[PDB]
């Protein structure tokens, strides 16, 4: 890498680790369009396994951002409106207060009040219907965002509906094969589990434990390669020669409802750039993060704007991941860990970085 590249990544990314004990990290930079790799540290520190640029991470909630283009490509192929009821796609959701929820809430976190997780109970596809016709909204519908696997999840197995696909089916065959994410994976293969990095959460070796709408909401597994690979996509959507795909990623970075000084699109979520760096590393904090805010709709949604700063947190028991970008400067970065830690640390290392490179 260029000498700036790499004295910022290392200068910023070597406290990081030693401060969160870290055991295993692989960091891309994305400037000017072209990705540069660092790895630190143990996929697997049993076997001694070092990070590589093939070895896999869990996502967590960064495979949001995948779900909200794989219903912006379903919106682009005609298959689904976000304006659309969600009883148009699950008409046994016949209780009441699914009047007036549509695909947009699901996908934005504003249906009013479906719970961040899916209740680990729920085990079987009839529990999960009673779970979602039971459920009791706090609020009206679009009045106030919280964030909830229980609802992004839903939408992301709704969009694919009417293709008749799997979930991920349709991912892979959608979203994956055309972008070459060909190390990016729902359920990771026996020929990629050398590559299959360990999570570590209190000392010990984790992976991801399975889920209703796991897949939809926090199931991805990726590496870095592949991931800055996802970065350049999003930055640059119109070389994608997919054209529903092409048009899916702009409609997942589209701005749908704002508070405060974030907007959300559909799993991506995006502050105005240059941002203040207060605002983005307190506001990735969970207690602001996961807290109920109300929120105002922008009439109609503005379209992806590319002076932003987009950006979504993940994380598993035993992972954290982060990535951002700024379309207009063609920049952005993908920090994955094999350790849950805090979300404000990952903002000012990915902040400290982009900005001293902007």
């Not at 920049?331 to 830690?341: D, E, F, P, R, S």
């Amino acid at each position: 890498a260029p000498q700036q590249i790499n004295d910022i990544v290392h200068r910023t990314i070597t406290p990081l680790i030693e401060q969160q004990k870290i055991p295993g990290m692989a960091v891309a930079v994305i400037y000017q369009g072209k990705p540069y790799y660092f790895t630190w540290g143990y996929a697997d520190i049993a076997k001694k396994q070092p990070v590589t640029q093939q070895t896999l991470f869990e996502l967590g909630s960064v495979s949001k951002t995948f779900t909200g283009v794989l219903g912006g490509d379903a919106i682009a192929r005609g298959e689904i409106k976000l304006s659309d009821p969600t009883t148009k796609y699950w008409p046994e959701l016949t209780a009441k207060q699914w009047n007036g929820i549509t695909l947009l809430h699901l996908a934005t976190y504003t249906a009013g009040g479906l719970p961040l997780q899916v209740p680990d109970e729920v085990k079987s596809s009839s529990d999960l219907l009673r779970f979602y016709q039971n459920w009791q909204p706090a609020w009206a519908p679009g009045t106030q965002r919280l964030y909830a696997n229980s609802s992004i999840g839903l939408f992301g197995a709704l969009a694919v509906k009417p293709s008749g696909l799997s979930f991920e089916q349709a991912m892979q065959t959608r979203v994956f094969q055309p972008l070459k994410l060909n190390h990016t994976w729902i359920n990771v293969p026996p020929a990629e589990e050398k590559n299959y990095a360990w999570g570590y959460r209190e000392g010990k070796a984790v992976h991801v434990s399975p889920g209703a709408l796991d897949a939809e909401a926090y199931g991805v597994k990726s590496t870095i390669e592949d991931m800055a690979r996802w970065v350049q996509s999003n930055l640059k959507p119109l070389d994608i020669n997919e054209k529903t795909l092409q048009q899916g990623i702009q409609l997942a970075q589209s701005r749908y409802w704002q508070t405060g000084d974030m907007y959300q699109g559909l799993g991506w979520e995006m502050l105005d750039w240059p941002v203040n760096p207060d605002s983005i590393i307190n506001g990735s904090d969970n207690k602001i993060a996961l807290a109920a805010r109300p929120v105002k709709a922008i009439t109609p949604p503005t379209p992806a704007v590319r002076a932003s700063w987009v950006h979504k947190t993940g994380a598993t028991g035993g992972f954290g991941s982060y990535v951002a970008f700024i379309p207009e400067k063609e920049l952005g970065i993908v920090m994955l860990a094999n350790k849950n830690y805090p979300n404000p640390a990952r903002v000012d290392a990915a902040w400290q970085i982009l900005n001293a490179l902007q």
